[PDB]
Structure 1
Amino acid sequence: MKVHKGDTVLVISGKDKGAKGKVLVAYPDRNKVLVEGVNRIKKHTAVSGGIVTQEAPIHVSNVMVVDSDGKPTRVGYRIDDETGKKVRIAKTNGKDI
């Protein structure tokens, strides 16, 4: 999907637009991902009762990977003549990701 676990991502649209974050888990079936620090929601937990803060899934279409230089970039692909492994490339820079 051009997005993996452990990458750095930025939000384009939504309540928390303009905030950077780090991805935790991915859901390819529903095309949704979970990012900490964005879309924080209050949940009622009762067993002892209280209110806690958690994170809800965000659709990937509203987020995209950031460049190592701190700028938003798309994802490109290249073919290596050495091993043939497919690599991710920053379109606006050409550097590998």
Structure 2
Amino acid sequence: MKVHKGDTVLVISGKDKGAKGKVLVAYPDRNKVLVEGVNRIKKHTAVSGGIVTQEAPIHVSNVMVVDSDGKPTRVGYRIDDETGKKVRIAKTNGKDI
């Protein structure tokens, strides 16, 4: 899906647009991704009860992976004639990520 765990993404729409964060988990079944530091919410939990803050999932289409140059970029794919593995491509520069 070119939005994988361990990557760095940039928020496009929402109150947290333009902020950088790191992906934690992804939900391919519902195409929703959980990124820390974005979609700030407040949860009330009572067992020892208090107000707690947790990360709200955001739809995967609302983020793009940022390149090593600090610019969000589309993702392409290449085929390596050596082994046949598929590596993602940053479209604006063509470099591998």
Q: TM-score by structure 2 length?
A: 0.97
Q: Which runs of 5+ in 2 are unaligned?
A: none
Residue by residue over 1:23-54, the C-alpha shift from the partner in whole angstroms, topping out at 9 and shown as x without a partner, is 00000000000000001111011111110111
Question: Once the 2 structures are TM-superposed, how far is the Cα of residue 56 of structure 1 from its aligned partner?
Answer: 1.0
Higher strand fraction: Structure 1 or Structure 2?
A: 1
Match of 1:3 in 2: 3
| Percent identity for Structure 1 against Structure 2 | 100
| Structure 1 alignment gaps of length 5 or more | none
TM-superposed CA distance for 1:85, in Å, is: 0.2
Question: For residues 46-83 of structure 1, what are the alpha-carbon distances to aligned partners after superposition, in whole Å with 9 as ceiling and x for unaligned?
Answer: 11111011111100111111001100111011111100
4+ runs of 1 displaced by more than 3 Å?
none
CA drift of 1:94 comes to: 0.7
Distance 1:2 1:90 in 2: 10
Match of 2:19 in 1: 19
TM-score, normalization: structure 1? Answer: 0.97
The yes-or-no answer on 1:55 pairing with 2:55 is yes
